[PDB]
Amino acid sequence: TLRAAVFDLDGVLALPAVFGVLGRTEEALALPRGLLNDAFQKGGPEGATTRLMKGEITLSQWIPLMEENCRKCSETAKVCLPKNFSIKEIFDKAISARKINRPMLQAALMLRKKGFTTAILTNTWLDDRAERDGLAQLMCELKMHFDFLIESCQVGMVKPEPQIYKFLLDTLKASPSEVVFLDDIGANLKPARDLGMVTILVQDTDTALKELEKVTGIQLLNTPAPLPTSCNPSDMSHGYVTVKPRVRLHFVELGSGPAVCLCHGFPESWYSWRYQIPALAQAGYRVLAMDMKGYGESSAPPEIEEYCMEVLCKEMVTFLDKLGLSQAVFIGHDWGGMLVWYMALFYPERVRAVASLNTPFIPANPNMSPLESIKANPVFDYQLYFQEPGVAEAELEQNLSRTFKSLFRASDESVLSMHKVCEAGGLFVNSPEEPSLSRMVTEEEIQFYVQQFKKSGFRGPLNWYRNMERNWKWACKSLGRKILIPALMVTAEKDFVLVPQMSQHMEDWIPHLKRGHIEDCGHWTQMDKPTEVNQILIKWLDSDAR
Amino acid sequence: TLRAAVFDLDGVLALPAVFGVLGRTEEALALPRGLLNDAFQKGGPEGATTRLMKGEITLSQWIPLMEENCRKCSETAKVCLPKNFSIKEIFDKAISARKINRPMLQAALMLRKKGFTTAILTNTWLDDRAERDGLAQLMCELKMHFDFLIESCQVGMVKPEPQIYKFLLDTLKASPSEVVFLDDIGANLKPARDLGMVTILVQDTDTALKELEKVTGIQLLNTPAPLPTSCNPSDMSHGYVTVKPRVRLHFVELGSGPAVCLCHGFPESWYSWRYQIPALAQAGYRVLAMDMKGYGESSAPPEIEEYCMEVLCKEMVTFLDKLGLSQAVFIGHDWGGMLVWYMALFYPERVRAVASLNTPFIPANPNMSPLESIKANPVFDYQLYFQEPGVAEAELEQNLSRTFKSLFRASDESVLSMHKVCEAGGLFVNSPEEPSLSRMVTEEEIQFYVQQFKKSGFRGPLNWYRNMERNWKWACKSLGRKILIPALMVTAEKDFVLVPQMSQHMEDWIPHLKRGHIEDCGHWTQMDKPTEVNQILIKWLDSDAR
Ligand SMILES: Cn1ccc(CNCCc2ccccc2)n1
Ligand SMILES: Cn1ccc(CNCCc2ccccc2)n1
Ligand SMILES: [Mg+2]
Ligand SMILES: [Mg+2]
């Protein structure tokens, strides 16, 4: 029966409410109780405040009217306003204090996940204050989570006028008995209840969610910790930069503030950062999530040396040149982790800070050929398997769904040891035809990877592994240097290919290295433990990159 | 004969040089003359400084070696270094003081314009200092103007070693007698002169350019003021955002810092901002230069109401939402100018500041139909001509080269009065078949517009003029408001359609409006007077938007 849920902003999705500051200010200043609310509501349907809420005048034009109202109210109550009494001041403070009410948003998120149409209906104003950006950010953050945002000042109607609820119903494409509406003002509920909507009077959040839970039949309270917000590819800004005649790099871009360039691993996509991209942008950064060369909508030339680290890195520098960025923070995972260490060693002027998930920095051994070093570690056997052009391509391209479903698995779910892969004849030779779906991924997310890899297959990706000698020779150039810019290494306890202990000497080359470590986290770090990754990167960004 | 020109960075393209700070620091501190240079050059080919210049060690690892050198030099000279003597300090200061030598860059620019291959060859270092971003910005700014940048620390060779000049020649694809090489160190010139290159020893800039001028046969000194840097479309980052199911907006993006959204006019392109985009990015902004709806690589649905101001503006808000931008500075010209005023009135929380070139803000007259108002001004006759769907499309699409060549003309070059256009039967009825090229545009630039307009023709563009009534009704909603965010109006003296005096009442609605005014500037403001536009916008951005 219920199909739609409508939330107010002030006092419902955001707290403390502003009217609360009229009450609080009265108390704090020992004014006659209600004096500020009387001034706020002066004139009723024809007073300044209604004209504000309807979009007739802006907030800045309203401020001196509320002033006059406060003066007139105090005169009739035979009191004085204190010296320095400031409506602008009171409101700047109330509007900055007001924060997203997290459990209410999470309820709305969950209900939207169960198929509810969700909306914010609010009496609000056109905000032209010097400090308006704070409200713009709050509204941005809330609104992406709802089907509709209906603002009194954009539609020219205000709660409790009956016409705005008719407009709501019409916007929802729903009948009134299909709708629950939450508000902290009883007068604002009545016209909804008159049309037969279920209504909830919100005082404390938990009681409102209890009523909301009872009436929808969906669990909303005491629910597990939800995953961070993910990205919908077709809602992203997609960017494309030609770094040389046959090579264009694609990236997805979100956020403003310091530039942060995410470099994914093998065989992955910009989409592997889907959980980090909204969280980092929300944290105050300009995120650029790449398709690395070889992948997705980036170019994939066939030649092996197009994918040596020297060339890949020079291209990343040109990418910054064409975008007009003097620096970015470089955050990499897996092969992308290897790449950002080399950006830090060869182009430190272009790297604001450097972080790697899983991939350690290990200086080239100038006394041992890289192939030998690889042969010494049985877990890198699969890398020998990758050398011969065409062999791994045929196995990995043969059935893309089976490829990504076999690779992208949590640490307690694996279906492929990296064990004597050459000798076995392939990576998947003892894995199922139709693996089950990992807890980490939905069938929809697997199909995005499959679709990306239909454009160029696995040749460009595999070529990243085919420059061992060439990368070793270039790396040997850097053996006298240290990495002295801000740097973060994040180890994953149960990554069995890139194990934590392989990073144990990094402080010899990077003396001020900072660390995070994620327990119970396998190789696909960003989608395995997205919440922990988010917290570790944002904390390190805010202290070291900013 | 000469075909290539090679410039050093320190002491040639950038001034003051750093060695100059060794000399200056000695003097300032009353140290033994040359002591700092002796320390800098200690050990020669095997000393710390050569290892730096070759990329063996980074700047930060070099600093304490130079320290030791200074100590050892002072001991043997039986003097003391002052308390607080700091190599880091000296170098941070010298590297920040060092600025692009403008007349040398302009010479290089001009020579490159006459077909020279140009290069920077420099002994420089890997810069990992906290303050490295300053050098990264200088290098970014210089390097886009040259064919090649060859850095000692990336190539592992240093002037004056002979191998670096061979590497240069090989990079240039030129023989030595085709090359002039400029350097401020005579020792660095010798190996070039040994190979038979023309060399110029640079002390003061003017004398070096005199020699450079004599030897190339090209005028380089006393030359007129060159145009600002323009954009090459295929070197730009191209971005695409879907704002609703059939509408994606394309934009070009350059720079970091506060977001600045450029909105072009009829019938134009993101490319109409080609002279502003590098200058604004260089001035510290994140430029987003749109194809507005209807144009270029943005979507162009056929329906008239898709192009009313309400819909266009809501889409610009969604564009900011999907990019994760809480605000941008909105700068518009012509129809794009009209649009940014309406963003300021309906979405001030999303607009950091607003500026318009040419287009005044004039409140809707609620007592007169917009068509009548249009009929009252003979210069807007062409707007009636535009009403009837299909008529203006056929004339404007018939020959695109002739269309843009006829429209894009300086004030002393016009070929079309806007005079009784209906009665004449078209916009071009008394203009030539093959107009001459305006001084404002090259044949190449005309052909870019022609190519853009082959994708969707003129239907979407003309539709901007076909919502007079619908725009009037929405504008009437805003008649109680004022624009109280930072705002700039730029009038063009000789724009005969959007004349300066039409803006004369704007302070009634925008009391703190700032102004610029460009004399001898016709309707195509950005390409008519790009230099003046640049200066006026950057000065207003730095004071009001930042
Ligand atoms: C030198 N290097 C850079 C990155 C790596 C590890 N790549 C693991 C990818 C993979 C994961 C599972 C199965 C096969 C391969 N090694
Ligand atoms: C209401 N409004 C917004 C913008 C304008 C002026 N458009 C001029 C374009 C043009 C220039 C030359 C020839 C024909 C048309 N009027
Ligand atoms: Mg409320
Ligand atoms: Mg020099």
Curated annotation (Swiss-Prot), chains A, B:
<feature type="binding site">
    <location>
        <position position="382"/>
    </location>
    <ligand>
        <name>substrate</name>
    </ligand>
</feature>
<dbReference type="GO" id="GO:0046839">
    <property type="term" value="P:phospholipid dephosphorylation"/>
</dbReference>
<keyword id="KW-0963">Cytoplasm</keyword>
<dbReference type="GO" id="GO:0000287">
    <property type="term" value="F:magnesium ion binding"/>
</dbReference>
<dbReference type="GO" id="GO:0033885">
    <property type="term" value="F:10-hydroxy-9-(phosphonooxy)octadecanoate phosphatase activity"/>
</dbReference>
<dbReference type="GO" id="GO:0090181">
    <property type="term" value="P:regulation of cholesterol metabolic process"/>
</dbReference>
<feature type="active site" description="Nucleophile">
    <location>
        <position position="334"/>
    </location>
</feature>
<dbReference type="InterPro" id="IPR011945">
    <property type="entry name" value="HAD-SF_ppase_IA/epoxid_hydro_N"/>
</dbReference>
<keyword id="KW-0576">Peroxisome</keyword>
<feature type="modified residue" description="N6-succinyllysine">
    <location>
        <position position="54"/>
    </location>
</feature>
<dbReference type="InterPro" id="IPR023214">
    <property type="entry name" value="HAD_sf"/>
</dbReference>
<dbReference type="GO" id="GO:0042803">
    <property type="term" value="F:protein homodimerization activity"/>
</dbReference>
<keyword id="KW-0216">Detoxification</keyword>
<dbReference type="Pfam" id="PF00561">
    <property type="entry name" value="Abhydrolase_1"/>
</dbReference>
<keyword id="KW-0058">Aromatic hydrocarbons catabolism</keyword>
<dbReference type="GO" id="GO:0004301">
    <property type="term" value="F:epoxide hydrolase activity"/>
</dbReference>
<dbReference type="GO" id="GO:0016791">
    <property type="term" value="F:phosphatase activity"/>
</dbReference>
<feature type="binding site">
    <location>
        <position position="184"/>
    </location>
    <ligand>
        <name>Mg(2+)</name>
    </ligand>
</feature>
<feature type="binding site">
    <location>
        <position position="8"/>
    </location>
    <ligand>
        <name>Mg(2+)</name>
    </ligand>
</feature>
<comment type="function">
    <text>Bifunctional enzyme. The N-terminal domain has lipid phosphatase activity, with the highest activity towards threo-9,10-phosphonooxy-hydroxy-octadecanoic acid, followed by erythro-9,10-phosphonooxy-hydroxy-octadecanoic acid, 12-phosphonooxy-octadec-9Z-enoic acid and 12-phosphonooxy-octadec-9E-enoic acid. Has phosphatase activity toward lyso-glycerophospholipids with also some lower activity toward lysolipids of sphingolipid and isoprenoid phosphates.</text>
</comment>
<keyword id="KW-0007">Acetylation</keyword>
<dbReference type="InterPro" id="IPR000073">
    <property type="entry name" value="AB_hydrolase_1"/>
</dbReference>
<feature type="binding site">
    <location>
        <begin position="122"/>
        <end position="123"/>
    </location>
    <ligand>
        <name>phosphate</name>
    </ligand>
</feature>
<dbReference type="GO" id="GO:0010628">
    <property type="term" value="P:positive regulation of gene expression"/>
</dbReference>
<dbReference type="GO" id="GO:0009636">
    <property type="term" value="P:response to toxic substance"/>
</dbReference>
<feature type="modified residue" description="N6-acetyllysine">
    <location>
        <position position="214"/>
    </location>
</feature>
<dbReference type="GO" id="GO:0016311">
    <property type="term" value="P:dephosphorylation"/>
</dbReference>
<feature type="domain" description="AB hydrolase-1">
    <location>
        <begin position="258"/>
        <end position="530"/>
    </location>
</feature>
<feature type="active site" description="Proton acceptor">
    <location>
        <position position="523"/>
    </location>
</feature>
<comment type="similarity">
    <text>Belongs to the AB hydrolase superfamily. Epoxide hydrolase family.</text>
</comment>
<keyword id="KW-0511">Multifunctional enzyme</keyword>
<dbReference type="GO" id="GO:0005829">
    <property type="term" value="C:cytosol"/>
</dbReference>
<keyword id="KW-0449">Lipoprotein</keyword>
<feature type="modified residue" description="N6-acetyllysine">
    <location>
        <position position="190"/>
    </location>
</feature>
<feature type="modified residue" description="Phosphoserine">
    <location>
        <position position="369"/>
    </location>
</feature>
<dbReference type="GO" id="GO:0005777">
    <property type="term" value="C:peroxisome"/>
</dbReference>
<dbReference type="InterPro" id="IPR029058">
    <property type="entry name" value="AB_hydrolase_fold"/>
</dbReference>
<comment type="subunit">
    <text>Homodimer.</text>
</comment>
<dbReference type="GO" id="GO:0015643">
    <property type="term" value="F:toxic substance binding"/>
</dbReference>
<dbReference type="InterPro" id="IPR006439">
    <property type="entry name" value="HAD-SF_hydro_IA"/>
</dbReference>
<dbReference type="InterPro" id="IPR036412">
    <property type="entry name" value="HAD-like_sf"/>
</dbReference>
<feature type="active site" description="Proton donor">
    <location>
        <position position="465"/>
    </location>
</feature>
